[PDB]
Amino acid sequence: STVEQVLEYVKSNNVKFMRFQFVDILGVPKNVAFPIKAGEKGIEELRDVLENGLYFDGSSIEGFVGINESDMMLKPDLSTFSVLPWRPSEKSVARVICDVYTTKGKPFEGDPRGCLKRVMEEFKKEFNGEYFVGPEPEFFLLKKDPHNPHKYIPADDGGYFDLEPMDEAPDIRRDIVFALENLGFHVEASHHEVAPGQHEVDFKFDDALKTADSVITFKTTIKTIAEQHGLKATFMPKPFFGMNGSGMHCHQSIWLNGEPSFYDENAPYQLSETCMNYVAGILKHAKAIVAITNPTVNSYKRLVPGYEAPVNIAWANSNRSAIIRVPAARGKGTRIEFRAPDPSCNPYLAFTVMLAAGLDGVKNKLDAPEPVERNIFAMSEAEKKELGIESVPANLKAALDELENNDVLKNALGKHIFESFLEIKNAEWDSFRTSVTDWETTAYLKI
Amino acid sequence: STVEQVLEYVKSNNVKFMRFQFVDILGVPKNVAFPIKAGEKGIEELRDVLENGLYFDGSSIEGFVGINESDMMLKPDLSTFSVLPWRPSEKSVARVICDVYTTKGKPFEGDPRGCLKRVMEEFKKEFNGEYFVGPEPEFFLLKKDPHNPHKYIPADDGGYFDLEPMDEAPDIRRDIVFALENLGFHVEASHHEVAPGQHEVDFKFDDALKTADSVITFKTTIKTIAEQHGLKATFMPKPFFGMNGSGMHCHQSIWLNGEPSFYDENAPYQLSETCMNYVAGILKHAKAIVAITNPTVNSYKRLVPGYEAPVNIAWANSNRSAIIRVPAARGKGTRIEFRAPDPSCNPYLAFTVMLAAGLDGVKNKLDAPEPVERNIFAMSEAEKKELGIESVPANLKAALDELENNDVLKNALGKHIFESFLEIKNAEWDSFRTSVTDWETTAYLKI
Amino acid sequence: TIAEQHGLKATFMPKPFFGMNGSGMHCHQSIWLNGEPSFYDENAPYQLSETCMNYVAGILKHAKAIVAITNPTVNSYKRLVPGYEAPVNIAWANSNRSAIIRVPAARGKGTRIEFRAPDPSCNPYLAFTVMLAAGLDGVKNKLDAPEPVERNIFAMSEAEKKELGIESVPANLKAALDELENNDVLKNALGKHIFESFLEIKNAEWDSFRTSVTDWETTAYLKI
Ligand SMILES: Nc1ncnc2c1ncn2[C@@H]1O[C@H](COP(=O)(O)OP(=O)(O)OP(=O)(O)O)[C@@H](O)[C@H]1O
Ligand SMILES: Nc1ncnc2c1ncn2[C@@H]1O[C@H](COP(=O)(O)OP(=O)(O)OP(=O)(O)O)[C@@H](O)[C@H]1O
Ligand SMILES: O=C(O)CCC(=O)C(=O)O
Ligand SMILES: O=C(O)CCC(=O)C(=O)O
Ligand SMILES: [Mg+2]
Questions:
Q1: What's A335-355 look like in SS3?
Q2: CA angle, residues B345, B349, B354, in degrees to nearest 5
Q3: Min distance B154 CA to chain C CA atoms (Å)
Q4: CB-based contact (8 Å) between B330 and chain A?
Q5: Catalytic position from the list A162, A167, A168, A193
Q6: Are strands A92-101 and A71-83 parallel, antiparallel or unpaired?
Q7: Are B348 and B112 in contact (CB under 8 A)?
Q8: CA angle A386-A387-A393, nearest 5°?
Q9: Is A436 left (phi over 0), alpha (psi -120 to 50) or beta?
Q10: Any CB–CB contact under 8 A between A234 and chain B?
């Protein structure tokens, strides 16, 4: 939208506050609220901030700048304008997502959003291509343990596609869908997921930048709506041992010159050569991609080699036992599902590395291996070794070491994001590996 | 006629009470309520009190007069007229900020407000200058510890620029902004600050006297609105060990003959000679300025030499590790940020000493040192010693001893305020230094 | 250990409770040369020898630095607190408990000086070292002791003490460490290793105290 359209909506819908939003290196949303004054004076002041942006302290944001070079700017992207449904209707609250700039008026090298914009701009200039993503960020709804109020348990005992009363969340999922529609999402479906208290609310795919903006907005919405219902929502990959973790499978496709390039009516599986080259790129860099798409210690309690998880580096058709599933849908619906990611990732960075890795396959015309039509979880380790089916790294540190040795992902992320992420995550790993866990006390106090 | 405008507002908006307000030497607001009677008789009784003022006992106000010379007067400044938003709408409550006078009709020498008026009047008479200040008084929102209802803890676990639900204060910050707008403030921005439960609500800079009035009104507004939400707000500089303290950074600039004299398009850093002379004055008197801008024992738990704090007596551009930061903004936005102050200061006295010190630099054309573009917190003590970077005093008593030996600040404050402040603060220091603290019981009971 | 056996806890903390006396460790001391009580002199004023006066003069000269060692905690300066009734006034007196040194009435082999500033948080080996090295600085150089103060020093005004030359010991641990750091007699007595380790340990202890947020501050300032 244009500055005029934004001011006009604010003017006629009594918007009182404008959130200027962005994300830190870990994908945590950040914002400052600008109060809109009454009259022409207020609209002119808003026009100035919307066009010229505002300053903030970059040294108080994770992965940004140091204290001695800390002044930074936010430049609003006006096409991201939305009204917050959870906030009041009278004297309402709108938001605008921003790109981080330096004081010199240049895009910040450490901005995750600008990082995704730049790889998308390069993809459009080099191939006239568009990168489309449909992510499915699952979550748990939690309530306090009646036996210990300091602990959280799943909000119900339901399972996949269950009906009420076993599924206790229709009212919560209902309000979430209404909120996402008011924020401009095209919601597709909602249902109880496999684990107790786990849920899914699907929204239509879009270009990687809009989709990344929606993943950030989506997580805030589920969390604030769950609070309104006296519950707590979590996007933690594996909150509970013994039940499913939450993934964020990323359905993705590239469209060259406005066409669904992954579809080929006369090819095997009706999948194009470009689709196979892209799949080959993702499988080649899968071990390093997971440092970014699965960036927490807990991510590897769901993405756990040796078990039933999206860890096996192979692709397959309508088969949920490989790291890539190719859904049965064809035509414009032809796409690949990268199953490894979880909702703890920074979507801007996750989409950057998946595109960079897939385009490494397209640019070099890499050969994809044969699909694996068997249940990979039913194969023995030696049978997978013979077939060449490798696994992703088994923990955060092993994934960071893969990322550190991947030139394609280092170039896509750029020096600043790449080195800050490795530094932050190495300190996070050090904190975990030096702690004394409850598992250890249970296992070893008796010795 | 300003009085005619006040009386007409009262007549037509059903105003029932008029608070006559002022501050004691420590900046604590004080007021007496006058009930407005109906009709022309009531309006003339109110006219008489607005014009002629009213009496009070100055011996019951800290830093004022003794019991044997205790009758004093309050002379309303009618440009301060405002309606209290927290008070009822029907039969509303208005306020007027007053200047303290003696029974002989003379401005009281011990009045902090008159003290700032007088230095500003002298600055306008001598240079045709205006003194503009933009302060940022941070605060914590507190709730009772569920484990001990006698103790207070931060109201949430959020951090800098966090969004809800982690940031739990959008409703409180919203009501604060509305209350400040109703009080005539030009609010600029609001957001969660670095520490858990900490927040910031910025308002536009103005002349030092209006800004000092606004700081007093701002702190009452924050505190009353927080109480309405079942929380407690504190402007204590360092309420909790291990997390950020609350500062009140003072952005300031002097405008000679209506122009932003700190801006110089053709000078290094685009900062004028006057700006450099002013910075040199603040740096010269910084050790004594902090007795007034950081006047509590607790102020030196945030302003603590040897740690990451605004203690290093140096200036820098877009660098938050020095006692003065010069923001990147230029033109009319050209200003210096004195980072040492905290919201426990009396803004009338704080603005007086900062202007007096800056003008000592302007009047004598003092040379400012070179800016320090490095992170001062990364330098060793010997490296700072070589560069001539000194630190502010380490505690209240050390700061009082600096103030006692500063003729520029003693003359700006005047004998009465200066001697009363030193006497009160020496008794406050004596109280602290003779107490047995919890730190000591933990450290030494075992010996 | 005996208090624990009675179900109680004993503490040698200098000032555990505000509003009541602290615990001191007054050190009565005397030097005997060639087996004789050299502090006693039957025919001298107060029956105190010249050696006794030289020793008292040495302790009073170094009192400001001695307290870094004899009063080595933050809490020591809540008992040893200048401006109040405490053994802070650098003067000596006979049978008078308002000075830093009291000379008890006993004479003969009982002739000695009572250094009242120390508290039981000190390392006695280091406390006795600095007191002896300061007293012997007075003996070796035959320093002149000031006149005794027979008045109640707590009843004097600050200006009256300033005129009489009655100074106070440092007001806190850090001020005492800074006095010790500038005293060559005590640095030589302790030696480089003990001296530098003590200053390093105590500066970290001071930093810990000065960065903490105390209960006094919460009570005083949470309401602002
Ligand atoms: N051509 C495409 N490119 C990228 N994403 C697409 C495309 N077509 C659909 N999607 C997106 O794929 C996501 C998953 O859709 P959908 O749930 O219908 O498939 P699915 O096989 O049922 O996956 P799952 O079983 O994991 O839920 C949706 O966000 C959808 O918008
Ligand atoms: N020329 C000026 N003179 C004095 N004050 C000014 C001037 N221009 C702006 N200010 C004030 O300075 C204050 C700082 O506002 P602002 O937050 O925009 O700057 P900032 O450098 O980002 O501060 P911070 O990052 O510490 O919050 C505001 O109160 C503003 O009104
Ligand atoms: O339950 C859902 O998933 C969506 C909402 C709904 O169907 C309902 O309101 O019953
Ligand atoms: O949250 C703030 O800082 C101001 C209030 C606001 O933005 C809101 O109502 O959501
Ligand atoms: Mg689905």
A1: CEEECCCCCCCCHHHHHHHHH
A2: 95
A3: 12
A4: no
A5: A193
A6: antiparallel
A7: yes
A8: 95
A9: beta
A10: no
B138 belongs to the catalytic site: yes
Q: Which amino acid is at A306?
A: G
Q: Which amino acid, one-letter code, is at C193?
A: H
With tokens 């786990």, the residue in question is A198
DSSP assignments along B311-378, one per residue:
TEE-EEES-TTSSEEE-S--GGG--EEE----TTS-HHHHHHHHHHHHHHHHHTTPPP-----S-GGG
- Which residues face B207 on adjacent strands? B132
CA distance B424 to B266: 48
Question: Is the preceding peptide bond at A327 cis, omega within 30 degrees of 0?
Answer: no
SS (H, E, C) B66-83: CHHHCEEEEEECHHHCEE
Q: Where are the alpha helices (DSSP H) in B99-241?
A: 112-127, 170-182, 208-228
Number of H helices, E strands in chain A: 13, 18
Handedness of CA A181, A185, A191, A194 (dihedral sign): negative
The active-site residue out of A249, A251, A302, A335 is A249
Task: Answer whether C touches A (≥3 Cβ pairs < 8 Å).
Answer: no
Shortest distance between the Cα of C3 and any Cα of chain B, in A, equals 13
**Are C148 and C48 contacting, i.e. CB atoms less than 8 angstroms apart?**
no
Q: Which of A390, A421, A435, A415 is nearest to A295 (CA)?
A: A421
Give the contacts of A36 (CB within 8 A, at least 6 positions apart): A10, A15, A16, A17, A18, A42, A43, A45, A46
Put simply, the answer to whether A32 touches B170 (Cβ < 8 Å) is no
B352 phi and psi angles, rounded to 5 deg:
-60, -50
- DSSP H helices, chain C, are 2-5, 50-70, 124-140, 158-164, 173-181, 184-190, 192-211, 215-221
Q: Which of B161, B185, B205 to mutate to test the pocket of ligand 2 (most atoms within 8 A of CB)?
A: B205
CA A261 to chain CA centroid, Å, is 24
Write down how long chain B is.
447
Q: Is A330 a catalytic residue?
A: no
Q: Using alpha carbons, select from C56, C186, C177, C87 the residue that is nearest to residue C129.
A: C186
Nearest-CA residue for atom 19 of ligand 1: A327
Residue A164, classed as helix, strand or coil, is coil
Say which residues have a Cβ less than 8 Å from residue B82's Cβ, sequence separation at least 6.
B94, B95, B183, B184, B217
Tokens 């000591």 belong to: B440
User: According to the entry, how was the structure determined?
Assistant: X-ray
**Contact assignment for B181 to A68 by CB distance below 8 Å:** no
> Amino acid identity, residue B440?
E
Full DSSP string of B227-260: HHTT-EEE--S--STTS----EEEEEEEEETTB-
